[PDB]
Design a protein around this ligand. Structure first.
Ligand SMILES: [Mg+2]
Ligand SMILES: [Mg+2]
Ligand SMILES: [Mg+2]
Ligand SMILES: [Mg+2]
Ligand SMILES: [Mg+2]
Ligand SMILES: [Mg+2]
Ligand SMILES: [Mg+2]
Ligand SMILES: [Mg+2]
Ligand SMILES: [Mg+2]
Ligand SMILES: [Mg+2]
Ligand SMILES: [Mg+2]
Ligand SMILES: [Mg+2]
Ligand SMILES: [Mg+2]
Ligand SMILES: [Mg+2]
Ligand SMILES: [Mg+2]
Ligand SMILES: [Mg+2]
Ligand SMILES: [Mg+2]
Ligand SMILES: [Mg+2]
Ligand SMILES: [Mg+2]
Ligand SMILES: [Mg+2]
Ligand SMILES: [Mg+2]
Ligand SMILES: [Mg+2]
Ligand SMILES: [Mg+2]
Ligand SMILES: [Mg+2]
Ligand SMILES: [Mg+2]
Ligand SMILES: [Mg+2]
Ligand SMILES: [Mg+2]
Ligand SMILES: [Mg+2]
Ligand SMILES: [Mg+2]
Ligand SMILES: [Mg+2]
Ligand SMILES: [Mg+2]
Ligand SMILES: [Mg+2]
Ligand SMILES: [Mg+2]
Ligand SMILES: [Mg+2]
Ligand SMILES: [Mg+2]
Ligand SMILES: [Mg+2]
Ligand SMILES: [Mg+2]
Ligand SMILES: [Mg+2]
Ligand SMILES: [Mg+2]
Ligand SMILES: [Mg+2]
Ligand SMILES: [Mg+2]
Ligand SMILES: [Mg+2]
Ligand SMILES: [Mg+2]
Ligand SMILES: [Mg+2]
Ligand SMILES: [Mg+2]
Ligand SMILES: [Mg+2]
Lengths: 159, 58, 169, 211, 296
RNA sequence: GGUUGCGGCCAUAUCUACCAGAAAGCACCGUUUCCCGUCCGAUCAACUGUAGUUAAGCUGGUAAGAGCCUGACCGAGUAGUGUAGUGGGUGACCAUACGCGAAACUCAGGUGCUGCAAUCU
RNA sequence: GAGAACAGAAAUCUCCAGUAGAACAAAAGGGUAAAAGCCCCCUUGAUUUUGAUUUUCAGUGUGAAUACAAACCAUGAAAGU
RNA sequence: AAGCUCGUAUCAGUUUUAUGAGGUAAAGCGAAUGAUUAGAGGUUCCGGGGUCGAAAUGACCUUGACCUAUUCUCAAACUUUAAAUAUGUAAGAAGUCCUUGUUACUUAAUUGAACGUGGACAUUUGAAUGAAGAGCUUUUAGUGGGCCAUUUUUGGUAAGC
């Protein structure tokens, strides 16, 4: 018969990162989480208590509770044609502050800066991100860069 | 007489007719499952500030 | 350059491999007691053989380790039995040395037929000052090469005092 | 009783080697892989000719063994039994199953039937090395061997020196300088890396920068 | 090592090294983890440690909190400071460890403010007691004994430092079953014996017992005790007066420092070999192939 | 700069073989009355800082060193792959079009960085 | 690997090397080195009260598990567990 | 089907940017495990044979194993490396900053934690493309034998299996 245990299929998912077995280093416990924080889940195999079920491996959620040795992360997992809300109780070994919003927070603070500099100066801020534009025209000189003429090569073996 | 065992065929089709609905975010989510020792204090901490605000409109 | 890397005896361990427990063992144990002063330790069997007649955990033998120049007085006592002639093998590549004599009576102790006659294993482990680096708890390190005890450096030490011989090739 | 090779020609399965899960597979029909003067030195046989696969198929062990014999028989009895070094570059590690036929298709997993060697396009099947004065004879050996194999294979003359990896001039430059070192039937090369101390113990004919 | 001993390259490739402070045999992480980690719902509240370490005869007491960049020394006290407070001998004995902890207690408790309040024990009689919180006041400063790798034995002297910081006004939770004068078969503590260790009573009685039994040894050790005319009996009032000297002024005098850092740096930079350049390293090889291989 | 105690990252820190180390600190090192632990004061506990030593630990330097780290239009736009055709071929399989793109290899460079506190010609 | 009377391939004693190549009831896979393995010491938290949570899911039940709360305890110098 | 509450509003089987996760394809085997061909150099007081031998912990041939540096070939239930396609999150008013109340939680501490009062900056207000709009509620039918195609893929010699 089939087998569908809590940790089935998880040979390498929970594996330990080559040459990085052993006790978890101390910064992992010195980190500090608060409500609203955005964390990424990645289970640590050595720490079997407080583990996330494999489904939330690789997933990113928001902290909704802070307790002695653990955090509560809500995840939107989708079952059927909808999403449902999932409260996870994870130990601090499997959670990691997400840089998925560092750039945004960076962009806000640098956008307040540019805006103050614009308002203190003359107007025309223009601070929305814009996608990769096509190149502008350019002139390419041939000085010391005369074009070489390549041809396709004949068949060979050298086995 | 055997018959088909299982398939996920057409299931995403159906799932998308009224298809996948975003999780409907709210301001002020619930405290469901939040640490009781925190919630107990938090209650009085809200009772007080409320009493404090009513005291600005004495 | 030799100021502090002298060549002391780390400890002397006597060992009597009785092939059985029971009276014969405590009797052989009693040999090591009056001989070492220290109370001896007995070793259980590691597994079962049935041709040596032993079961696992059967208190096969007894032994005792003696540091502390009290050890020298027994090393010499037995080197007198070997007539101060060892062999070249006799000497680990890591610098220790050991031998074996039967009839513990050949070193001092009287007969007492209620005890019997037992053989011994004399094993002497050598070291230099500052071997503690390997044996302590904090900052446990390993002793440098030019401080480790060698077979050459021990044989010359053994020839020098006791004025003993070092026989065949 | 051995099924026709046609049944097992294409690579229709994932590799099914003899393993602790398989455990019960018959011996391989090809069991020797180096024939002729295999003891010989690298300088002894510069010319090298390959039997090269042109298909993505499976070669049985029974067809390797029959082809090893064919090619080795012809070469020796024309050029000499120590005139060449035949090397079979293809090992039959894939197991073929068979549903030995009351019950029907129910539970059809098969027992080991034989071994085969999975073989890519361009993959080399045979390799022989000789004096160039034996090129003809060797090529005819591999040409006769082809009739023992399903699928198209082509014989190719190597640009390399014997079983070495260096082409004829590039190998000569290394040997005729100082950097080659005989070793049984192969050769060690002098690296510019590692302990300078014993880099001169071995390869002493170097460091003069001459013949 | 032996020829049949050498490590393959494969061994070395797949070898995982431990943490540096483990290969150095210095940091027990399995302990450090449980010492440092804070309850996640207190969020920034540092867990301070009363680290005690014994060099070969110098006692170190630091109050330390932890940061991912490195730990933080709130304040430190070394038993080599004890001369300032009237102790010159046995700066590594049990009563020396008591004084240091007391010093580490008063010094921080001073620079934290809970100085006039929380004086700890001043009538030191070796009784077992912890610093109790003041009724309607700042709770006492809480620190946790970081023993390090010291092997816990009943009557060890790491716990002398502990008794001093506990008697100094720090809250260092502890049980009394590792203090000298704790009975084995009845779970009880003789405070008269523990008070004795706090004032060097085991050393005083020793100096007495050697003064009239083997004066050849009493001269070699206790040499400096002769050089200052300190027989045993007076050894108690030395540590008693030191206790006062500590509580009077713990403010940490530093050294007069005699040759500023720059000067210290130059002198040592002499005795420090500096690496070679790749050109230098290449020149020694090409010179070597001319030498060892060039047929003399 | 050195050293120490507590560290962070956890081999650019490990490994093998040699040599070098002033000052201070570590250290080795002496002792067994006391608390305390052993078959053994070796480890562990206590006492001295006195009797001795840089030999070892430690620190650094050397090596066409092993390992490790970094880079490279080195290999390689390769292997693989998403998309396309009433493309080729008996088939096995293979080219082509719009994209994404490795690994090994090879060669060059490198061999701990750093936080707090105390200390030192 | 090198050493020790009887002692032999295998008894017990010592030293060196040793990234786990062992052991952790059991299938296998994870995991683990001042431990999660081995030896010792003290124990009953394998306890009391009712909720939330994850997997299986209909987001029913059951099983199994996770993080708190409120007790009473164990252990350790302690942080802790 | 009935609708209901709203409507520049929020919305997306899509791209972009930023930040995660994964062990498949490939690749690897002079890297671990496990397979596999060939020699070459070492090792025995110590696997068995054989000459001399009274023996030898004796020399010398021999064959096996082992060690060293090489060599041909492999893996669904092997692997350091490691894609492509797929995949989690974020791209602001529910935002950012400042001033300082509340509590029985929490801190050595008016320390923090959470929730606030007062204040500052509006549409280039924070990527792209789209939008016959968005959200919400109830109630009920039929269905619960499926089959085919390209690609991935298991069993089978194979099958319009
Ligand atoms: Mg299954
Ligand atoms: Mg490890
Ligand atoms: Mg459990
Ligand atoms: Mg039916
Ligand atoms: Mg059917
Ligand atoms: Mg059906
Ligand atoms: Mg069924
Ligand atoms: Mg017997
Ligand atoms: Mg196919
Ligand atoms: Mg198949
Ligand atoms: Mg079966
Ligand atoms: Mg392949
Ligand atoms: Mg053919
Ligand atoms: Mg090659
Ligand atoms: Mg501990
Ligand atoms: Mg000095
Ligand atoms: Mg001693
Ligand atoms: Mg000690
Ligand atoms: Mg030196
Ligand atoms: Mg010296
Ligand atoms: Mg040190
Ligand atoms: Mg190197
Ligand atoms: Mg493709
Ligand atoms: Mg086609
Ligand atoms: Mg292709
Ligand atoms: Mg298991
Ligand atoms: Mg530990
Ligand atoms: Mg029960
Ligand atoms: Mg199911
Ligand atoms: Mg339901
Ligand atoms: Mg039901
Ligand atoms: Mg998988
Ligand atoms: Mg593959
Ligand atoms: Mg690879
Ligand atoms: Mg392999
Ligand atoms: Mg190599
Ligand atoms: Mg794989
Ligand atoms: Mg997407
Ligand atoms: Mg529009
Ligand atoms: Mg509209
Ligand atoms: Mg319906
Ligand atoms: Mg229905
Ligand atoms: Mg129905
Ligand atoms: Mg049904
Ligand atoms: Mg179609
Ligand atoms: Mg069908």
């Amino acid at each position: 018969g089939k087998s569908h245990g809590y940790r089935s299929r998880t040979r390498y998912m929970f594996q330990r990162d080559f040459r990085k077995h052993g006790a978890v280093h101390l910064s992992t416990y010195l980190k500090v989480y608060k409500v609203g924080d955005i964390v990424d889940i990645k289970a640590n195999g050595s720490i079997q208590k407080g583990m996330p079920h494999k489904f939330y491996q690789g997933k990113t959620g928001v902290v909704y509770n802070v307790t002695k040795s653990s955090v509560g992360v809500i995840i939107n997992k989708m079952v059927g044609n909808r999403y449902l809300e999932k409260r996870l109780n994870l130990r601090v070994e499997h959670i990691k502050h997400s840089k998925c919003r560092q750039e945004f927070l960076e962009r806000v603070k640098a956008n307040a800066a540019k805006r103050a500099e614009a308002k203190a100066q003359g107007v025309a801020v223009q601070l929305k991100r814009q996608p990769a534009q096509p190149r502008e025209s350019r002139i390419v000189s041939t000085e010391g860069n005369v074009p070489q003429t390549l041809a396709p090569v004949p068949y060979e073996t050298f086995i | 007489a055997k018959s088909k065992n299982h398939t996920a065929h057409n299931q995403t089709r159906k799932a998308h007719r009224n298809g996948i609905k975003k999780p409907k975010t709210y301001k002020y989510p619930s405290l469901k499952g939040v640490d009781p020792k925190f919630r107990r204090n938090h209650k009085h901490a809200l009772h007080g500030t409320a009493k404090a605000l009513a005291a600005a409109k004495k | 350059q030799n100021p502090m890397r002298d060549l002391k005896i780390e400890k002397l361990v006597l060992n009597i491999s009785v092939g059985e427990s029971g009276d014969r063992l405590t009797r052989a144990s009693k040999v090591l007691e009056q001989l070492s002063g220290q109370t001896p330790v007995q070793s259980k069997a590691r597994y079962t053989v049935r041709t040596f007649g032993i079961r696992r955990n059967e208190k096969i033998a007894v032994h005792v380790t003696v540091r502390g120049p009290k050890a020298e007085e027994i090393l010499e006592r037995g080197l007198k039995v070997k007539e101060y002639q060892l062999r070249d093998r006799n000497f680990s590549a890591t610098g220790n040395f050991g031998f074996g004599i039967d009839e513990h009576i050949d070193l001092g102790i009287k007969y007492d037929p209620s005890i019997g006659i037992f053989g011994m294993d004399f094993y002497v482990v050598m070291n230099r000052p500052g071997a503690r680096v390997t044996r302590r708890k904090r900052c446990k390190g390993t002793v440098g090469n030019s401080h480790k005890t060698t077979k050459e450096d021990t044989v010359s030490w053994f020839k020098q005092k006791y004025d003993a011989d070092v026989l065949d090739k | 009783a051995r099924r026709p090779a046609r049944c097992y020609r294409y690579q229709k399965n994932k590799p099914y080697p003899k393993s602790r899960y398989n455990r019960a597979v018959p011996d391989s029909k090809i069991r020797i892989y180096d024939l002729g003067k295999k003891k010989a030195t690298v300088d002894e046989f510069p010319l090298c000719v390959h039997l090269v696969s042109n298909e993505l198929e499976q070669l049985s062990s029974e067809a390797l063994e029959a082809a090893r014999i064919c090619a080795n028989k012809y070469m020796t009895t024309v050029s000499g039994r120590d005139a060449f070094h035949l090397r079979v570059r293809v090992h039959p590690f894939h197991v073929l199953r068979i549903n030995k036929m009351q019950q029907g298709m129910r539970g059809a997993w098969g027992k080991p039937h034989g071994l085969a060697a999975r073989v890519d396009i361009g993959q080399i099947i045979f390799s022989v090395r000789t004096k160039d004065s034996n090129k003809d004879v060797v090529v005819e050996g591999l040409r006769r061997a082809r009739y023992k194999f399903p699928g198209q294979q082509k014989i190719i003359l190597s640009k390399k020196w014997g079983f070495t990896n260096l082409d004829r001039p590039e190998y000569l430059k290394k040997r005729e300088a100082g950097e080659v070192k005989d070793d049984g039937a192969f050769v060690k090369f002098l690296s510019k890396k590692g302990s300078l101390e014993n880099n001169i113990r071995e390869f002493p004919e170097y460091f003069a920068a001459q013949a | 090592a032996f020829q049949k001993d050498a490590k393959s390259s494969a061994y070395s490739s797949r070898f995982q090294t431990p943490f540096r402070r483990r290969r150095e045999g210095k940091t027990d992480y399995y302990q450090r983890k449980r010492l440092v980690t804070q309850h996640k719902a207190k969020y920034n509240t540092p867990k301070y440690r009363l680290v005690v370490r014994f060099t070969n005869k110098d006692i170190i007491c630091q109050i330390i909190s932890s940061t991912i960049t490195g730990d933080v020394v709130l304040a430190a006290a070394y038993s080599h400071e004890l001369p300032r407070y009237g102790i010159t001998h046995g700066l590594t004995n049990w009563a020396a460890a008591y004084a240091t902890g007391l010093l580490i207690a008063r010094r921080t408790l001073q620079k934290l403010g809970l100085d006039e309040t929380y004086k700890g024990v001043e009538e030191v009689e070796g009784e077992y007691e912890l610093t109790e919180a003041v009724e309607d006041g700042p709770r006492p400063f809480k620190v946790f004994l970081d023993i390090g790798l010291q092997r816990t034995t009943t009557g060890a002297r790491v716990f002398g430092a502990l008794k001093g910081a506990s008697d100094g006004g720090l809250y260092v939770p502890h049980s009394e079953n590792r203090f000298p004068g704790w009975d084995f078969e009845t779970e009880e503590i003789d405070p008269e014996l523990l008070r004795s260790y706090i004032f060097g009573g085991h050393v005083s009685q020793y100096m007495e017992e050697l003064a009239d039994d083997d004066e050849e040894r009493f001269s070699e050790l206790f040499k400096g005790y002769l050089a200052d005319d300190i027989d045993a009996d007076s050894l108690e009032d030395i540590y008693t007066s030191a206790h006062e000297a500590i509580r009077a002024d713990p403010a940490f005098k530093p050294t007069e420092k005699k040759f500023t850092k720059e000067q210290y740096a130059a002198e040592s930079k002499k005795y420090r070999q500096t690496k070679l350049s790749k050109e230098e390293r290449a020149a020694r090889v090409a010179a070597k192939i001319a030498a060892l291989a060039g047929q003399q």
